[PDB]
Every structure is written in C-alpha cells, then in structure tokens.
Design a binder for this molecule. Sequence first.
Ligand code: U5P
Ligand code: U5P
Lengths: 318, 318
Amino acid sequence: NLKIKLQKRRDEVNTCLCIGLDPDEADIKSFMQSEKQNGYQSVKKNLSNSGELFAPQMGGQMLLATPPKEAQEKDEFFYFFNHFCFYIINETKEYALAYKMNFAFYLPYGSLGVDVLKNVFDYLHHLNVPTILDIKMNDIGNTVKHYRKFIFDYLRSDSCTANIYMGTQMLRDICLDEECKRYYSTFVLVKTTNADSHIFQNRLSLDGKEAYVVIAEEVQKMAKQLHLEENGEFVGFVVGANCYDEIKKIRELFPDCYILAPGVGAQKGDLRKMLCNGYSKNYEKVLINVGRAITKSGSPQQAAREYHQQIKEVLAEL
Amino acid sequence: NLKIKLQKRRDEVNTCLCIGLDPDEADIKSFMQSEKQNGYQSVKKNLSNSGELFAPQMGGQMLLATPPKEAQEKDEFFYFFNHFCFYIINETKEYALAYKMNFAFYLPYGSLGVDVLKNVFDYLHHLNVPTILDIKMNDIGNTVKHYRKFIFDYLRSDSCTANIYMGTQMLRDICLDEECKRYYSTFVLVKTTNADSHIFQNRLSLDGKEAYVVIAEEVQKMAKQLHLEENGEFVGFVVGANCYDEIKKIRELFPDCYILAPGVGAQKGDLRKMLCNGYSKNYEKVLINVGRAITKSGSPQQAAREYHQQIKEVLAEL
Ligand SMILES: O=c1ccn([C@@H]2O[C@H](COP(=O)(O)O)[C@@H](O)[C@H]2O)c(=O)[nH]1
Ligand SMILES: O=c1ccn([C@@H]2O[C@H](COP(=O)(O)O)[C@@H](O)[C@H]2O)c(=O)[nH]1
C-alpha cells in the first residue's frame, strides 16, 4: 500500500522531490554520443551499480553486454534509450521520493519505447522506489479496465495520473480491480501548468465555485465512496507548481490530500512559493516533480542534489 | 487531406458507419479457439483477401504463414490478435466510412499489442480507409509533440481524439507539425456516453452556457486561429450517441462541424434519435462509431451490414 510506502521512502531520503524521466530524441542521441566518446562510462556504472543486480526482462542480454554495432540502428537506439534512463535513475535515486515517467516520451518509436518503459518500471520496482506513470488516462469504464491492466498489472506502477472531464465514476475502474480486492492510487488533473489553463479550470464554475474546486470536491466524494484510504490508497490531485492561489486553496479545502506538482525548472514554477502555499507537515503530500531541469542538466546528480537542498531549506522554514 | 478523403470515402461506401476495433482478451482467445477448430478459415481469408496483397511490417513472416505452436504462447497470442483485427477489417470494410481503434486495448500485453496496432494502422493505410486513434490525448505542448509523432508519423493515423481540459493551446501541437507545414485533424471530447457525464460537462457553466458548449466554442475559436480548414483539416467533436440534446445543440451552433458519436450498440445509444438530431447533409460529418455490437456479434459482417442498412434508411428519412 502506497501511503505507507511514500511515508517510509520520505523518511529514507528526507525530501519530496519527484524526478521526471521524460527522455527525448536529443537526450538519447546526446547520451549515445558522449558514451561513445568517453568509452561507455555511464553504462559501466549502470551495470555495476544496479543493486541483487538488476536483470532487465526486455532485451536483457543485449543491455547487460559490448554495445550493439552502429549498423544495427534500432538495437543501438534501444540500448542507449534504456541506459540513458538507468543513468538518470542511478545518478539521482539517493535524492528521489519518487519517479514520474510521462508515457508520451516512450511512444514515438513504436513498441521499442514500451519495452524501454517496462525495463524502467521493472528497475524501479527492483529498487522499490515509488513510481508514477503520467498517462492522464480518461475513458469509459470498460476501456479504463484495459488501462488499469497495463498500468498496474503490466508495469506494476504505484500510481498514475487521470483526467476526469468525463466524470468521477471512471475512478471505480482505475482505483479498484474487478473483484474489488486490489486498490490503486491515482492523481486527478485539477490545475495545470500551461499558460491558458484558466480557460476552463477557472472560468467555468458552479454555484460560485471555480471548476478546479468542483473537480477536486467531486473527486474526493468518489474517493471516499471507494474506500481507498482504508485500503492504504488515495486519489490525489495534480496542481501545477505555478498555480499558487490554487494550491493554497486545495490544501485548505483538503488538508490531508496528496498533491503532485509539476512545473519547477523548465516551466519556471516558483518552488518556494508553491511549497509554502501547498505545505503539509506530512511532506510526501506535495510531490515536486522536476524533469528537464535535471535530465537536460550538465550533471543530473548535481541538479537533483541542488533541488534536494532547496526543498530541505524551504521545509526547514516551514 | 482528411476532409476530401472522408468525402470520397463517403461516396464510395454510402454510409457514415465508423467501425470500432477494440479487441479484448476474450475476443482474441475466442477467435483463436474457433480458428483452431474450423482449421484457420478466417486467417486463410486474411491471407488472400488483403488486396497488392498486404505485407505486415511487424512479425510479417510469421503472420503470413502454418500458425505458431501452442508452446510459443506469446507468438501464438500475437498471431491471433493480428488475425482477429484483420478478420474484422476484411469482414466489414465494404460497410465502413472509417475505423476507430481505442489505444487502451492494445496496451495490456506490453509492446506486443503496440506491434499489433502498428500492423492494423499499416493495413488500413494499405487499404486507404480513414482511421482514428481513440487516445483522448492531453498534456502540455512539449509532451503533446511526442504524442503527435506516435499518432501521425509512426501510425500515420488520419485523426485522433483529444481532451482539452487543460486548454485549447494544446491543439497547436497536435494539429500542426513543428515547422507549421503539415496539418492534422483531431476530435475533442465535448459530451461523453458515461452515465455521470453531466457532472462537469453540463453542471459547470460560464455566462449561462454549459461547459460542453464553452468547450466547443473555444475549440472552434482555436481551430480557426490554426487555419486547419484552409489546409484540408478540422477539429471535430466527440458527442455521445446518447447525448441527444447536446448533439442537436452542437449541430445548431456549428452547422459545418465534424462529429464523432460513440455509444450505439453495447451502450444502447439511440442511432435514429442521435442521427436525426446531429444530422448534416454532408453525412461524413456524423461518424457513428459501433464497436462491440459488431466485434462481439456472431457475424461481424452481418452486424455491420445491418447498421449500414439502418443508417441508409434513417438518412433517407432525412
Ligand atoms: O499541468 C501539468 C501536468 C503534467 N505535466 C507533466 O509534468 C512533466 C513536466 O516536466 P518538466 O517540465 O519538469 O520537464 C511533463 O511530463 C509534463 O507532461 C506538466 O508539466 N504540467
Ligand atoms: O464518450 C465516449 C468517448 C469514447 N468512447 C469510446 O468509443 C468506443 C465505444 O465502443 P462500443 O461501446 O461501441 O464497443 C470505446 O472505444 C470507448 O472507449 C465512448 O464509448 N464514449
């Protein structure tokens, strides 16, 4: 159960930093270039530092090797995609409460990237680090059951994100299995980081309440009807790191809620302002996601350490 | 460009029936059982009737063969998943304006199902039948670019579905490539078929207008700013087949809009009532999606022919 897992992890790493692992083609190609030049230094670390060492299920023999030849363009790309991901994990895991992998990044190459994603989730499962698939899933119940199988049975993710524009009944098919015997956590989109996010989230309303509030309220009504919390799980909220007024409102209305807050770093969200406004003494309840500001930095480990330090200093103020 | 493609196809098949291809585990297993017993009758048709015959890129040699042995459980499953999909297509293509494949169904088995999905889209591309990926995509622009690559470059889909809870700016990154030189169509969720769909879509409002209307209006404002229609493309709307009041309102507000209307068949939507309310003389502008009522019927070809007939009779009334 996730609530205990997050609490245990929080005490181990003393942070609420969530590392975003969203690799793009340039990331992979660049890592490949630098590894070819430095003689595969980061892959060597991946192979020794995976502790009980990890055995990838998808292309394990080739990943655990010398690298594929340049003539094998697909295999080479798969090798360097997997090892890029493992490199980020190994460079940053000491500083991470969780990892969030955005599904979109693992799709442009067809099934190749899904095998990578499987190896990533399997590695995180090996390390027992909390995991989130940013899939923003939304559909009718029958279809949602199939998303559930992929996210929770196949990837064995700890949580995912969901978009509830359709209604809250969909939560019944993502947060519970068929038999009503296994329970899963999700984070519902409430306020997003994009510039025009107010157009529906704030401008629409009911009975004096902005849409994002109505969405949050209805979500927790459903979470209570599903008995998630008695079964060690929760429905959390995605609230953008640049959404200062909203994160304050959400923490006020739902003191015990779990918030996932992307937007610090590449998107210029004010970490200190958001963490202050969103603060919970139980600080696993504000996951501060940082992707590109770590994965595209000269030194992912140093970047992660820096955010870890900032968050520590801000938590101390609070 | 899609608008001409749909018009041409409409004149060829004289219908607006959109076949949903959402195979579940029971569908695949059942097809496998019956093929083993009838001596692979449907696969034989798949192999001869694919015209210039189709050559699958993913596992083509094994798919074009005798079937895999039962000991090879994964290969067997892939073989029967692909051939189930090809069977539905071959049994129904004479009656289909388009096919809509819901992404969720192609995920529970990991990368295996994505290879199947690639072969499905590639076959439809071979046949030049209009295609829709029901992915309900929603994210920030940077991430949306990666969904675009998968949907439009990799799968070469004609269109997809999108959820615009985040805002309409996201349309810029799904409907246009980076260079602003290729244009793509999408259908935005407006009104959905699930029982509690009114909770946000109708109960939220702005200035007397229900949410689904505000969403539609803002969508078309953005579609016009993107110049899709001058480039042969459109942003359409998903409006449930059981959403009679809303489909009427949407057709009234946007006489020239393209509607995708799921819900007939398994979900009990009233085809005649919806088609009447949503009617356009340009009848490719109401795609009536029917999935399970065809794919789980004793005879997909007969089921498709029946819907084809009903739609013809209703269009004649109108
Ligand atoms: O409102 C939201 C919801 C989700 N994300 C996701 O969070 C991550 C932000 O990554 P980065 O900007 O830190 O690289 C990406 O996966 C993005 O899709 C946002 O940025 N904003
Ligand atoms: O409001 C919506 C939006 C999408 N779909 C999708 O349309 C298809 C309906 O299939 P069926 O009920 O005809 O089998 C499924 O892919 C489902 O996910 C709906 O049913 N309703």
